[PDB]
Symmetry: C5
Subunit: 103 residues, 5 copies
């Protein structure tokens, strides 16, 4: 198994690492039908989503999607610094695959 | 895809954005039958609900409704500033579709 | 839908509003069989329960009962002021139907 | 229903009350197979478990066991004073049936 | 039934204790398919995983794996000192079986 987010991210196509080293600037979540998602931004303007669950996800990812939204909310509220995001860059906004927090 | 709450809200009929830029003033929740819901108010008197789950909601919204109540409770308790609410205005109190939090 | 806890409470028989405007003084929870419940008290001694789930509860209430115990625990630990409780007064301790929190 | 943890405890065989009036000194939790459990200790050395779910438990206790582990973890992390534990004393470590917190 | 993490760890093949007595330095979590996992590190470089749920795990462990990831996230965010980890050291990074928090 990978030992860090960069190596994990590299195991997938259409991904990249974004380095933020900053707290989340805004947290948005929706219960509207077909847009059951979260969106975060950083003060540099960078915007990321947790995608709506769909046919692109395998069953094992469903619980992890819900956990990621839990993690973003509590990171936002505690002002935790986000080190890196692994995202899929074939989506707009880029779609989060993994998060690392440090400092 | 939408990149913010205003753009998301616009995708739906019978919605509008309320701009609060304030912490929640009160948080109410109920387990009484057929009123399993949350109500929030702001100091300006504005009152909003998370609707009781019902036939107006598709399955994917049910988990998101539960998450929204989780979010309002911890936003309340942490005195997190609510930036905007996307609501359906064909309900009384206006029914929350989405929330954004920012500093 | 109700604008506030008082109007919600009034929709049910055997209910009353208790106005506390105080933090919870003690929190008790049990996993013992047939007593899977929570009990809270206030400084003046007044005691309230979240009832064990049972045949008086409709299915939609089961999730809301679990949420209420979550809410009471974090309210307790954060010393959040409880404004009002809506309770069923045909049970001893009075059984919580809804809670409002406000500063 | 009982008004307090001492009366609750008295409804069961093989139980006793421990009065700690202290924060939890250590929190341990395990995902190891057949030992999916929590263990807490106090400064004086007293040790308690949340038992692995088992055939001695009825279905209504399953959710309550998971909630108890949630409660112990957050009590530990917040240094919340534990007033009393109701335990089964026919297990080693004694098995938690109920907890009360009062500052 | 064990009284502490060391004795629990010793009930399993291919385990060891790590004594850290330090807060978590970084927290990583992923929703990427087949890598639905968490990774933590300490300032001395020690790296640990919560494994992806899989054929090595029995049913009873599934909730406990989810709980473990919850615990590591909140330990990280609260800067809780980790005393010891019980791990399987037949995996790279070593795989967490249990955690103790103290002091
Ligand atoms: O949130 C919605 N999501 C879209 C997803 N689904 C596709 C079509 O079948 C059902 C909904 C959605 C909300 C709609 O609105 C209705 O439901 C809302 C809660 O979901 C609110 O209760 C609102 O007051 C009500 O009018 C109406 C429609 N619509 O009339 O198509 C879609
Ligand atoms: O919260 C309730 N709303 C809807 C649930 N209903 C419960 C009974 O089966 C029918 C549906 C509700 C509460 C009712 O009250 C009953 O259940 C309560 C918990 O729900 C309390 O336990 C209360 O002490 C008890 O009398 C009675 C009715 N009723 O007689 O219609 C409705
Ligand atoms: O034999 C039991 N029930 C029937 C006896 N009566 C039940 C009502 O109280 C008074 C005595 C009985 C045994 C119980 O205890 C058993 O299960 C416990 C976990 O639930 C502990 O594991 C305990 O170590 C174990 O002996 C517990 C309960 N319970 O939590 O309801 C009932
Ligand atoms: O955690 C296990 N629980 C099963 C029950 N307990 C097993 C040990 O004796 C006490 C009872 C268990 C773990 C085992 O170990 C395996 O799974 C671990 C995760 O569970 C790790 O993935 C570890 O790297 C791996 O070797 C192997 C077996 N097995 O081959 O049956 C059981
Ligand atoms: O995260 C992946 N995990 C590996 C499991 N795979 C899931 C899809 O079915 C194939 C097996 C995975 C991600 C993939 O990426 C796809 O899904 C992502 C969400 O999971 C994002 O939505 C991304 O935008 C999309 O391209 C594509 C594949 N793929 O083409 O195999 C695998």
């Amino acid at each position: 198994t990978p030992q860090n987010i960069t190596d994990l991210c590299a195991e997938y196509h259409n991904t990249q690492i974004h380095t933020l080293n900053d707290k989340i600037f805004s947290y948005t979540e929706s219960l509207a039908g077909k847009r059951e998602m979260a969106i975060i931004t950083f003060k540099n303007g960078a915007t990321f989503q947790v995608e709506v669950p769909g046919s692109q996800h395998i069953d094992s990812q469903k619980k992890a999607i819900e956990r990621m939204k839990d993690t973003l909310r509590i990171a936002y509220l505690t002002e935790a610094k986000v080190e890196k995001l692994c995202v899929w860059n074939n989506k707009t906004p880029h779609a989060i695959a993994a998060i690392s927090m440090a400092n």
